[PDB]
Structures are given as C-alpha cells and as structure tokens.
Write a protein that binds this ligand. Structure first.
Ligand SMILES: [Zn+2]
Ligand SMILES: [Zn+2]
Lengths: 135, 301, 301, 143, 303, 301
C-alpha cells in the first residue's frame, strides 16, 4: 500500500499504540504483528503528520517509521521528543481541574538527566514521566 | 504472676518487656482455648469520645468473647475528669478513645480502682494496635527476635508505627529498614532510641532494595490530608505496593497494614500468600481479650 | 438436613419453596417454644450502613432472644475491606446498605461467616417478605389459595415485589393490584405471574373487591418521588379508613410493612382486621428463624 | 497458516480491536497476527486475529458471541485444522460488561462484573449478579 | 398603552398573546440598543427564598444592565409568615424578583406588596415565566417566528414545569407541530394534550428522536429529574434519550437544540461544537427577557 | 501600549516583567488619581466557588471604586465549563476563586472574549496577592531592585510565597533570606529557579541572624492544620515575631503578612512603625483596580 508503517516497536507497546492514538478508528487495512520480540503496525493509505510521529517518542523511543508511496520506502524516520503531549496523558494531581471536565489534557515536555518532566497546562505542577505514565 | 491485674493500659512505653511477653502469651492461649464466660457479670464501658468503628467493633467483640456486658457511645462543657468520675461508678473497666493526647492518662487519675484501657489518645499512644501487631508478627514468624522488619510509607505521623518500633526494640537483634519520603521520615527521637540500644537500622528509597531480606513488610497509612495533592501523587506512585513487587520475597514473609489500605496495597496482594492484614485485624480480638482478662483477673486460666 | 445451615440470606429469588416452608416452620416453632440460649456464645454484627432503626431493633432483638451477643453501627475504603475485617470478628453479619448488591458483594468476602440482607437499596429485603408470609400463614392458616389485595404504590416498593414473587411460589392464589397508573405493579412481575398461570386483575378502588380479599396489603406510598399535587389525589383515592371494612371477611387481615401515617387512618387500629403491629411483632420470629437456621446444623423443636 | 494455535475469522470490522482490548488478547508472549478491515467476499470488510500456541475453550469462544455473532474459530495443530467452531450465546458473561445501574455495588468495588444471559424476541437480557436488575443488551453495551 | 406597567408577572397562563408579544418585542429592542440607565434610582429586591444561583445571577445582571440597585438574599440556610416578609420588603423596594419552594408564593406576595410588582422566579412545581419567555425569545431569534414550527420536546415531560409553560405559550401562536418524545412514565400530562386538542394543534408521540429529526426545528431537551426514579430505570431512560452528535446528521441547518440547563445527563458534550448547539445562547437570552420584564413593569413610556 | 487589555490574569508565571511594571504603575496612578466611573455600565462576576470573604470584599470594593456593577456568589453535578459558558453570556469579566488547581485556566477556554481574573485556584496561583505585595514593597522601599527580602515561616505550602519569589526574581540584585523549619522549607523548584538566574539566597534559623540587613520582613501564615500540635508548638515558639525583635531593624524596613496573622505577629508590632500588613491589605484595592481597568480598557487615563 501507499501509506505509513511502524517497525521495531517494543513488545506490548504495539497494542498500546493502537489504543492510545485511536489507530484502529480508520477504514484502511491494518497489519499488526505482536511478538517477533518486536511488535510492528502498518496502515494502508495513511500518512502521519510531522509531530504526529513525535508523540510516539515516550512509548517507542528507539523505533522506526517508514513511509510508502511505492512498493518501496519513500522516507524513514525516528521519533523525537515533542514540545507538548496532548490528549493521551492523565494528570497525577487528583485535585487538577482537568479531571471530570470536558477538556483535553496537555503537558509541556522537558528532558532531564534521569526522567522526563511533564508540566500540566492546567494545575501547573511538574511530574516525572514515570509518575504520569503509571496509568 | 499476673502483674497487670488492676493496672491501666495507657502507653506502650509503660509496658515492660515482661508485660509484653505476658499479654502475647495470654493472647495465644486465649486464641487456642476459648474462655467465653471468663468475664461474666462484668460490665465494660466502650467510650469512643472519638469515633472509630473498626476499633470499637474489635474491642466490643473481645468483650463479648469473654462474656462481658458492654455499654458505651460513639461521639460537652463538662470536663473529662467529671465524665470519668461518673462512669467509674457504673462499670468495671473503661475502654476509651479520645481526640486529645493524655486523655487516658488523665482518666486514670479519676477512675479510682477501675482500670482504664487506651483505644487511642490523639497523637500519642494506641497500645492495643501495637499489641495485635506483635501478636501477628510473632505468630507468623515464630519469634519477635532477630527479624528483618521494613516499615514503608508515612513514618513521621502514624502513632502506631512509632509505638511498634519502640516495642520491637524491646526485643533484640532486629534489623529495621525505613522506606519513606523525606517529608515523612522516621522521627529523630526514634532513631536515637535505636542508636542508644545498638539496634540496626538503614534508610532506603524503595522496597525493592531490600525485599529479599524482609520478614515483615509493614505498610503504614499515608496521611494524604497533610500533603499537597501533587506531592501525594508522587508519594503514592513511589510507595504503593502491588503483587508484582513480591518476586524476591521470602516464603515466610508477611505484609501487614493497620488499615484502611486503599492507597497503599493494591488488591493484587490479597490473593498472594504474603497478604496478612486481614489476619492481622482478626488477631486484634485476641490481643484485646488478653488485655481485658489480664486486667480483670489475678489468676491465669 | 437443615438446607439453610451456613447458607447466605440475600434475595427472595434465591429462596426455594422448601427453604420458605422451613423458615416459616422454624418461626412458628420458636414462637411457640422460645429457645433463649440456642445461640449462646455467638457474636453477631449489626451493620446498618444505612440507618433503619425499626429494622435494626427487630433484628437485634431476635439476636438477643436467641441469646447471641451483638456488635454494630448505623450510618475511600471499600465495602470488601470492611466485610473482610468484620468476618474475622463475628459469626454472622446482618447488614443494611444503600447500594443494590451490597449483601451479595459481602458474601464473596465474608469467608465462612454468613451474611443476612436487611435491605440492599432498591433490590431485596428478604426478612420483610419472610415476616409478611409468616403473618399471612398464622392469620389465614395457609399460603395457598388466598385472595391477596395489594393497595398503594406498587412500582417502587421492594417489599411488595418480594412478597408477590414469594406468593407466586405457592398455589391457587388470586391477586388484586389496586394502585394509580403512575405506580403500577411492573410488567416483570405481571409477566412472572402469567408465566406461572396465576390469576390477577387490576382495580382502581379497594371497594370493588373488598368482599373476597383475605389479605389487604397496604404499601408506604413513596411521597418523595411524586408531586405534592399528584400525591393529594393518590392519598385521597387509596387511603384506608375503617368505614371501608363493612364488606370484609371475618378472617381478613390488614398488613402494612410500616410506617402507615398516610395510608391507614387511625380508625382501623381498633377493628379486628388490623394486623400491621402484629405483623411487625412477627418479624421477631422470622428473624429469629433465619438466625437459628443459619447458625445451627440440627434443630429439634 | 501457522505451526500451532487459534485463528478467528469473519469478525465484523471494528469489532476486531474491541476483541483485543476487552479480552486482553495481546497480553501474551506468543506471536499474534491481526488484520483490521481485511477484504473478503464472505463478509465484505472483516477483521482477523491469529495466535500461536494458544487455545480457546468452549466458553472462551462463546464469550465472543455478543460482539461478533457470525464469526469462526479454527484450531491449527501441525498447520491444519483439528477443530472448527462458532460462538454460541453463553449462560453468563463476566468481567467485560459494566452495570448500567449506577448505584450498583459493582462499581466502586474490587469484584468482577457478571450478567446472566437470556435471549428474547428482539434483544438479549443481561441480569446483573449483584443488583439483580435485568437490562437489554443494548442498554448495557451502549458504553 | 403599556398594559404591563405596575403589573405582576406571576404565570404564563396569565399573559395574553398580546402581553407575550410586548415582552418579546421589548426584549429584542433592548438587546439591539441597550438602555443602561433606564432604571436609575430604582431599587429591586432579589429574594431567592430557594437558592438558584444561575437564575439569581441572570436576574440580578438584568437589573444592573438597566442601572438598577439590587438588594436581597439567596438563603437556603423562620416562624414569621411570608405575608409579613413581603409586607415589609414592599416598603423598601420598587420591584420584587422572588423564588420560593411553595407553589403560589409569588401570587400570595402580590396580595401583600401593595403597589410594588412581584416577578416570579419560580414557585415550586407551578410557574417559572421568565424561563419560558427567554425560551420563546430564543426560538424566535433563531427561527424568525413562533408560528408554523416543528417543536420536539425530549426527556422528562411529566414533571418539568417550564416545558408545560412552553407548550402553553407556543399554543398561543399558530400552526405549530409538537413531537413529544419521552418514556411512558414521564409523558406530557393529559391537561396539556387536552389544551392542544381544544385548539386543534398537531401533536404526536414518539419513542425515539430519530423518527422525527428530519422535520424538527427546535429540539427542546428537558432535564430528566433523576431523583424521582430508580437508578436502574433511569439507566434505561438516559440510554434511550441522551443526545450525541451522531444524532444530528439528518437535522435541518436552521434547527437549534435547546436545554434549560443543567444538561449533564441529556446532551453529550460532542454536541457543543456543532452549529445546532444553542443552549448557552439560550441562557444568555435570559438577560433580555428579564430586562424586558423589569422595564415594562417599571415605566409607562418607551425610549 | 496596554498589552493586557482583554487578556486573562491567571498565573504570575505568565505576567512578564513589563506586564508587572505596567500593573504596578497603573495601580500607583489609580491610587493617586481616583477614576470612579472608569468602568460604569460594566457588570463583573464575583464568583467565589471557594469562600474567602477578605479576598472577595477587596475585589468587590475595587469593582465599585471603578463604578462597575457586581453580581456573584460565595459557595453541583454540572461541570465548571458549563457554569463558565453560561456566566460569560451575562457579564464583562469573571473574578473567580476555586478549590481546584487549574480552574481559572479552564474557565478561559469557555469564557470566550470575557477576561478571567484568578482570585486563587487551589494550590496553584493567586496573582492579585503577589501584585498587591509588590505594590506595597515598591511603594514603601522606592524600588523592587537590589532589596534585602526575608521570608519567615511556612515556605513549603503557601502558594503566594512561591508566587512572590518568582515575581521578585524578575527584578535583579535581590538578596533572599529563607527562615523556616526543615519540614516547611522553600521547595527545590524555587531554589533552582533562583540559582539559574544567579540570584542570592541564604538559609537561616532565626530572624535575628539577619534582621540588621532586611528591607522586607515577609511573614507567612503557617498552616498548622498540616502539623502535629506538638511540632507546631515548637514552630510558633521559634518563628513568632514580637516587637522586641526589631531593635536592629532599618528605619525603612516593613513587616508584611498576607493575613490572617494570629499566630505569627504579636500585637506588639502593630504600634511600631515597621507594621505594614494592614497598609498592605489596603493596597490590594489598587492592585485590583489596576488589573480590572487594564483588562477592560485599551486606553490609559
Ligand atoms: Zn494537572
Ligand atoms: Zn448491577
């Protein structure tokens, strides 16, 4: 197909990537292979935007995304950590207005020595990505 | 023989090593041999100046398990001394919980010959909690000596965890691991107490550092209400315990919590053989039958 | 075979016809020959997560009439946890709860300690339907082939659904449902009745049928749900006054699960047709019944 | 084909990902191959799942009935079919459904959901194990 | 001349079609050219015997938009009669806006206020004129007319007083078709249907909004009064009747979705961003219907 | 010219050094030249989702001082977004205080063109408090630069003290003294912020170490409610300020408290010329007239 493909996904991150980013809410054919151990997802007639690939950085850091306009590669890339992460993350501060309210989550992103810092748009608290990501 | 008959049970810092041993032994014996009419015709006052229905149910069950009668209440311009002076005329023992520190001690000065039992006096003492803890550690481990004991969570504020450290330092060769965030550390007075007895203690940041060694994983209830919601998000993330954390655990190791355990021990643990916090609460009935019977009889059995 | 020994009492839909007859029989026999030490040394938990001091008193009295001990309470930690704790304390758990399913939920965490349901929100209230049955028994002499009128709110009262369900487990009964359109007996009950080929009719006034009725069952109209205007017309239509009992059979009995302020005028109290305080009195024996049946393997009466 | 395992053919498209999520089908270490919006003249557009060295029981397949009624499960031993099967509506469905009654004890508490199943003319009735209320499958499944 | 000057505003059943037309007209006029000091030196008592702070804020904003002073209370937390309270307050103030738990209280006030007009912010299950007025003003402003409309009303139709009011008021205009979409236990009451028949106005029942979406001009969502029902049966109501954007594919481009608010369990937030969502615009219009009422009751003239 | 017209005032971390200067200047000019009809015909919403009557009175006074109208409330299944979406249709600005962090930010996403002003959003921000602080330091000292600023008390929890440090670090050559017990220290994020700007800060244990140098003695309100009563007894003993502590004080030095000051500043201070916490609160009206006028006019004067 003439679309986009994601190679070298850490095992058990394939199903999550399909889930968190609503990749199965399209009409195209999707090929998915879990545990080769490397997960991989592929979508026909689907091209990913610039920052759209960036958002995978936190979950599949060392992973490759290849573009297909022919039966061969038209452009290969790796995800780079973005300035902001919207929609998919949940704020650990339980007093955050974000919860129960009809707004999308948003965190500023900031690399550190050991952790990645995620500062909430709303409650303005900064957390280590390990705390934010623990569901 | 029974040096606790007609004594008040107020503070763990007043129970001697021998007194501790006496209660534990009486508890084990009462657990194994029911004595359901030992305290027939006694009336006991269940005085919860501060509500706490888990504690109250546990005590009152102890009371009927020895066939006593119970009267009481669960929630004032008149002094506490006046209240106790009246209630002593009515009853044969006063079990009492109070928001203010020193309330049980003060009750003893106006209860006359009637023994006062402390169900918790504000920030100070909670003897029965430490007693049923010890009875559970001892019953599961076979001993109270030369144990590896981790205490994880909030160690600055829980009175019962200071209590339990003091009482375990009355036994020897114990190794203590204090796993808690800086703002909720074990207080200085406790560490100094341990140093003056040449008792072993180390700090750590995560239960994984030491899980391989521990015989007792003692989880406290973090008092979130004192903290910023953000700060607590980071604490709960670090220190919550789930079953995945128990790969190194010794087969004899037990997880203990004074309860309620909502934000500290995931329900994964419940199904593992290391889960002993409900057995721990159940054991409270015998530590409390023990205390009641010892203070209301001079004769054993 | 006491096929209720150590079994849970959760829902009238889980009680078999023989289970019902067994309860009624134990009730009548305990009522006739009291057994005040049958449950000596047992401790029972009276857990009213939702207050209901009429129900609570009746249960706790049953507990004491069989010589049991009692502990309890009225009005982030799960119910599973509290139940897991309390079952280590006690031998049986009576519990009322605002949420449907709470008693069933308790049984999965109570271990070997049986839980009896004093009401779980809008679902079930077994002991109420039990004492209603026991009252129809003793007054009519039988549960079969009776003319049973049910007057008031029939959409919302759990007790009247329970009671209909259980009378449909006996034979030859004829049902009269006398209620305003907005509070009719639900289809699922009407369906159940058709599917058992049981005869039932609708009427808009108790006068139409008074001559045949053997049991006049008044519900507590749930005023709170309705408009005070709507309620004015209902109360006028369906309230029962003694002048309404000229046609009644000399055996006919009036029942109300209680409170009856706005349904049965005080005129009725003095007529021999009034059995709603005797009905409530009988709750003692139906609840004594269940406690005895669930906590003794043999019962020779 | 595969060396050994299970295969689920003729899944209503857009019910494939649901099956992976609700039944935690990707929580294994074995190889899984899946294809969403595959083309077939047998279905139109379908979904397909394949799992090496994993077998589904009678009820495990029956439990797919409510989401993919017309669907097929094939067992693959030594690269050939040894048992062919279809989903049948089960007697009860646990864990995956949520009680619509918001007051159900079910919700805040650490138990698994459970509804007894009963077919009717137009809908399937699902009666909750806890609150004992019965709902149309359409009310239960509507989020 | 201005037949509402010094008149009480108590019930939608007391306003003639002429009174209605005058309010609607005064409102639109005030909306387009504000009159920020028309009521200078007037003092108005905002007496919410029953709290209702959206209603209170909208009324009190209205008063200030015409430069009136406001004194009052929203007290929900008492042995002296209501007659006396009104007897006293009428000597203090120039107009009384009033909300009360008991039906008839604004009527009872008018009998003790002397010359001071009382406006009804709700008297229990009876009346709430201002809500129905700002509804009318909204339907008009969005459609261009209150006649020859297809008006669907979905949700609880037995209990919401404002939806009875609104049907009564729309029945004073011509050629309207009403669709009543509600569960059987919460149907439009018989007296409302009787009224519509006695005027030969078209109405049908439905079980699902999809039956009629193609024809509808106003989709008026009521607040299902959860508290009256079992949470179980309520699960079935909410499931049937909740409105999401997937329901608005057939809808006409002129159609507006209206809700008196709060809409937590009736209108999904997916709707909010579509062009059909007009329930916050609806609520803003309470400013103009309520400015209107104040103005008309407190002057003979018109600027 | 006025880059704050039609902007929301949400967080001090979003006001630029130039924005800060603009407010302060507008405040001083409004203080010196009343402009009591500048906002005639505007209606402003005084929305205290969380009661705070000192704050509310200060704002509402600011509002009438500019001749605006005010509507509001001082204490919900419906979302906050819905509330704000409605209130924006009514009014020209929304002043709002809320228990939850992020509430003002969230309001802006549903207020459309109506500017939102933050009167405090839980643990996060309180812009107006920091603004009236700065206006008081500046008005009393002649400058916001190269000042000696001590902040004494609880520095871990007060949002306004973190706020005020951030805003003073937008001015340069300031020297900070942090005088607070270990459990209530200045948080790390603030110290790091100061280090990354090469701004001078030292820790001390008592105000006496440095009193000679300070231009601003800024007392926080210790949140006793978080602490053990004993622990607080020791804090209050150390850090309370009485007039006897002001012998070295520079004649220009001012004592500032956000209020209430019961357990921090003895009434001895009130009579001394260093007492400026009531002047500070009074100054809140002009910092708030400033903010209102700047967001509701593009033209200065
Ligand atoms: Zn947040
Ligand atoms: Zn349920």
């Amino acid at each position: 197909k003439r679309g986009t493909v994601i190679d070298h996904i850490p095992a058990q991150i394939g199903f999550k990537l399909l889930s968190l980013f609503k990749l199965t809410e399209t009409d195209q054919r999707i090929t998915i292979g879990l545990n080769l151990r490397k997960d991989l997802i592929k979508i026909e007639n689907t091209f990913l935007s610039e920052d759209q690939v960036d958002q995978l950085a936190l979950y599949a850091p060392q992973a490759t995304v290849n573009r297909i306009d022919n039966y061969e590669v038209v452009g290969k890339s790796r995800p780079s950590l973005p300035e902001r992460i919207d929609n998919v993350l949940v704020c650990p501060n339980s007093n955050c207005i974000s919860h129960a309210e009809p707004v999308s989550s948003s965190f500023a992103v900031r690399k550190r020595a050991n952790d990645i810092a995620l500062k909430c748009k709303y409650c303005e608290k900064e957390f280590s990505h390990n705390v934010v990501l623990a569901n | 023989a029974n040096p606790l008959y007609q004594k008040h049970i107020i503070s763990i810092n007043d129970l001697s090593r021998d007194d501790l041993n006496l209660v534990l032994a009486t508890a084990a014996k009462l657990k194994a041999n029911p004595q359901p009419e030992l305290l027939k015709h006694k009336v006991i006052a269940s005085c919860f100046f501060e509500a706490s229905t888990r504690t109250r149910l546990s005590f009152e069950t102890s009371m009927h398990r020895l066939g006593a009668s119970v009267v009481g209440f669960s929630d004032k311009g008149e002094t506490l001394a006046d209240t106790i002076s009246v209630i002593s005329t009515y009853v044969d023992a006063i079990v009492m919980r109070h928001p203010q520190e020193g309330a049980a001690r003060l009750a003893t000065e106006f209860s006359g010959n009637v023994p006062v039992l402390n169900a918790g006096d504000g920030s100070n003492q909670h003897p029965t909690q430490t007693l049923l803890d010890l009875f559970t550690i001892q019953e599961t481990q076979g001993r109270l000596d030369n144990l590896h004991v981790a205490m994880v969570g909030d160690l600055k504020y829980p009175r019962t965890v200071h209590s339990l450290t003091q009482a375990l330092a009355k036994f020897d060769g114990n190794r203590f691991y204090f796993i808690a965030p800086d703002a909720l550390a074990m207080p200085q007075y406790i560490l100094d107490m341990l140093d003056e007895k040449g008792i072993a203690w180390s700090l750590h940041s995560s239960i994984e550092e030491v899980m391989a060694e521990v015989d007792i994983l003692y989880m406290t209830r973090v008092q979130k209400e004192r903290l910023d919601p953000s700060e607590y998000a980071n604490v709960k993330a670090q220190f919550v315990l789930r079953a995945s954390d128990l790969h190194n655990a010794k087969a004899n190791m037990k997880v203990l919590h004074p309860l309620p355990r909502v934000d500290e021990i995931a329900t994964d643990v419940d199904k593992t053989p290391h889960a002993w916090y409900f057995q721990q609460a159940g054991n409270g009935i015998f530590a409390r039958q023990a205390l009641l019977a010892l203070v209301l009889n001079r004769d054993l059995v």
